[PDB]
């Protein structure tokens, strides 16, 4: 797609997914960098009143969220962020997918499966949430693995549901996770 080296079947499938996404007019992407929870609530309440009511939110790499009041203390910054996002989700009555990085603690552990502790900052996000689900793809660490093309979704907390370890297949050539109707886990 970023080269133009594509064939008729591909041109077609692109036309199809495009002509699908245009007819619904669901998605609304904000390409602004250093937002605050104030602005997030504002934009979300804006898309809400006009277009019915939203159904889902995604927030990429939470830690970029700011609030300049608490710019001197970072942990409290993240705490305010998390409370704001939870309150938002409770306000508009939707979920809030909120990504977050992890710290380099699981590297000196020899297992490399992330635990609920290994969250990038403040540890409130391991408290304010109804659901955490980490990701683990063994072929990144292990080239000696017989478990490649396989990415497993290590749930790590769920207040109203079970813990687990879901299993899915990664094909990053087209940036998709798909279901793994394979052996058990």
């Amino acid at each position: 797609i970023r080269t133009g080296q594509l064939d008729d079947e591909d041109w077609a499938r692109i036309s199809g997914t495009m002509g699908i996404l245009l007819e619904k007019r669901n998605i609304y992407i904000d390409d602004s960098s250093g937002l605050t929870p104030t602005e997030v609530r504002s934009r979300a309440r804006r898309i809400a009143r006009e277009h019915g009511g939203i159904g889902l939110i995604m927030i990429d790499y939470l830690q970029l969220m700011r609030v300049p009041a608490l710019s001197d203390n970072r942990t409290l910054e993240i705490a305010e962020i998390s409370r704001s996002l939870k309150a938002l989700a409770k306000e508009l009555n939707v979920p809030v997918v909120a990504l977050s990085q992890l710290n380099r603690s699981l590297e000196q552990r020899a297992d490399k499966r992330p635990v609920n502790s290994d969250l990038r900052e403040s540890g409130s996000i391991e408290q304010d949430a109804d659901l955490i689900m980490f990701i683990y793809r063994d072929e990144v660490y292990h080239e000696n693995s017989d478990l490649k093309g396989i990415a497993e979704i290590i749930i790590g907390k769920q207040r109203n549901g079970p813990i687990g370890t879901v299993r899915l297949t990664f094909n990053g050539q087209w940036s998709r996770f798909d279901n793994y109707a394979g052996p058990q886990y």
Binding site: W11, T17, E23, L147, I150, D178
Partner: protein, 239 residues
Amino acid sequence: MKNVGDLMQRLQKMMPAHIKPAFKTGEELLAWQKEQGAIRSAALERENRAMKMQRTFNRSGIRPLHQNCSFENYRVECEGQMNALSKARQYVEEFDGNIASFIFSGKPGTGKNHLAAAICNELLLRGKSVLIITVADIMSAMKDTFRNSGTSEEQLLNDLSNVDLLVIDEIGVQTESKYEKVIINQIVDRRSSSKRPTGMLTNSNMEEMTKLLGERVMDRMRLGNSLWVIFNWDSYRSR
């Protein structure tokens, strides 16, 4: 700035006509993704099973000498050749969930590995695992496993028992190693008792074999149609 038709038209400026977008909706696109994902999952699993054999061992289950080794090229000379060949055919066909071992006994140069590899060539198309291997190479794997603490010989034996059709080669020799005995009985124990097949290749007689191969091993070998095919012929390559 631009609308549905205008954008799609600016894009047909690239792509030629007679373009069936093939979905038109979401209810079908999700189903198509589901289908293709199950397909790619199956292919992925096949590839990783293969890699598991290449990692636990080396030497892809069939070797390039016995790779082009089906039933057809087995030149016919006599009636025992039919007694072996057609019996092998029905052994392949009746292999599914069958506790049916086999021992080809006979002199070298007689095509024992050949038919045992025709079997395996078929079972690769069936979608099963195979391995022709020499006990020397097995014990080499054991004694290399002793070195590294990343793989261990129980993991190795589990890899062996997890095989669909294992066969052993160059067994008739009277190597007296206690540690060879404890492995060669244990493997067939862990396979037969785990309700899986296996079949050896030898140059020896039943009683010649039965002092090296313990009574228990022959006992766990002789099941159903145990297939005591024997070659009492003259070597091929001298022709």
